[PDB]
């Protein structure tokens, strides 16, 4: 519908915000650069980076950023200082008309897609582990007049070699009449593979 | 439309405006980065504005990126729209929708600039030399207005009514539009983006 076009646009905006932020994780940093906290009920992701003022808006010091889904909203938090805790509290998307029903994050390590509790540390030797990219998934729903037909999450996705719905623990969706849309997108993480 | 429906609709629209503002802010913050030559061009009118900007890519800073990039925005066909390009003084053609163009209609976009404590809004190019910028732009102010349909209609909205202004910036500088009592629900956002690369 009109509804699906609009919701897909929200997911795109959201992806662009998240991608630009996560591409910078590990920039010029030594120490803990990323923490992934997945669960079968959904995922959290936290990252840190060095500010050089002039190049990225948020910014000569370390910053933390985070995202997770709480009570139907994708939420975001920020902080300053080495290993600071961002506390994702501000909504990005959802929590009322739009309901964000799933957020998932996987990482690419030397050609293999993984999804597990994992910290990434940067050291003179290098990154541990070597993360080339992140995969991010969002599912969301809106009410629509007269209801919409059933949605099977993962159905509209195009997957990179090796990445699966099972790795992502993609949810079921109820036949509740809500119109659903989803997005899988990949963010390269060159600062974590260096 | 009930109060509840209007609240829901308004919350959702405001969140879209916020996402949009973050996308634009992060893009415009970089304008002039490590660049010599023409870094920003503002094209305002009483019916709305266009803004174009250029910057140096350092590979490692931005996904899209050692070369010059152009970015642009304006509103047309009920969308805020964006174009990009590569190369010194390339023309970005704002084609791709950022927000709107169907259910959501973006009705107005305005850009003003802060120069040495004075807000301005006029046809203006910003040129960088190594010594610094001509003129010295500290920040940009951006305004968006958009509308959605709501079941049974919403009451009429006055544009500018919700806004909170920084010192020295005024509605008359922004030439804010009127809005019809068409039954569509409206929301708006004014936000400010610092431009350190344009202020030396």
Numbering used by the authors:
A (entry chain B): 39 to 97, 102 to 236
B (entry chain A): 33 to 97, 102 to 236
Wording from the paper:
T4P are composed of both major and minor pilin components, although major pilins comprise the majority of the pilin subunits within each fibre. Three of the remaining six, TTHA1218, TTHA1219 and TTHA1222, yielded crystals of truncated forms which enabled us to solve their structures (designated here as Tt121836-123, Tt121933-236 and Tt122238-123).
Tt121933-236 crystallized in two different crystal forms; the higher resolution form, at 1.85 Å resolution in spacegroup P21, has four molecules in the asymmetric unit, arranged as a dimer of dimers. The second crystal form, in spacegroup C2, has a dimer in the asymmetric unit; crucially, the interface between the A and B chain dimer is preserved in this crystal form, providing further evidence that this dimer is not a crystallization artifact. The monomer-monomer interface is dominated by the helix-helix interaction across the non-crystallographic 2-fold symmetry axis. This has the effect of covering the external face of the conserved sheet. Tt121933-236 is also stabilized by two disulphide bonds, between β2/β3, and β4/β5; both lie within the variable β-sheet. Our results show that TTHA1218 and TTHA1219 are closer in structure to T2SS pseudopilins than to other type IV pilins for which structures are currently available.
